[PDB]
């Protein structure tokens, strides 16, 4: 069980990192092309930031 916990802790941390790409953090979308297909880069710049 001590060897299994190192495998489980490392695999859980990598799943949290990939699922964090579906957050928008306050922007209008989490998809980077949908900001670049409905805004112009004066204030599409402030949503990518």
């Amino acid at each position: 069980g001590k060897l299994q916990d190192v495998v489980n802790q490392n695999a859980q941390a990598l799943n949290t990192l990939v699922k964090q790409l579906s957050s928008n953090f306050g922007a209008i979308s989490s998809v980077l092309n949908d900001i670049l297909s409905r805004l112009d880069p004066p204030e599409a710049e402030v949503q990518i930031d």
């Binding site: 112009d40 880069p41 004066p42 204030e43």
Partner: protein
């Protein structure tokens, strides 16, 4: 006057005067219905262009616009356009 700004659209901003998005300067404007009106038919502007301007580029070319798919030459006929039309300025008109 709202088209003289960084990153604006409209036929003054797409086809006549394109400010860059990283601009450093000032834009100054004032109403001149004292002198510029009476109409006047030498204050022109462009309506048609095959691709948008880059920042700080002007263009003088009276090429007739390929707006019909079949070509025309020299003479404005069907779907042929002279790109420069004028402003109809008259002091009875409302502001705007």
């Amino acid at each position: 006057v709202r088209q003289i700004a960084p990153g604006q659209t409209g036929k003054i901003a797409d086809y006549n005067y394109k400010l860059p998005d990283d601009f450093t300067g000032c834009v100054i404007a004032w109403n001149s219905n004292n002198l510029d009106s009476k109409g006047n038919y030498n204050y022109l502007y462009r309506l048609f262009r095959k691709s948008n301007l880059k920042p700080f580029e002007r263009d003088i070319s009276t090429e007739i616009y390929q707006a019909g798919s079949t070509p025309c030459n020299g003479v404005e006929g069907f779907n042929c356009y002279f790109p420069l039309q004028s402003y109809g300025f008259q002091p009875t008109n409302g502001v705007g």
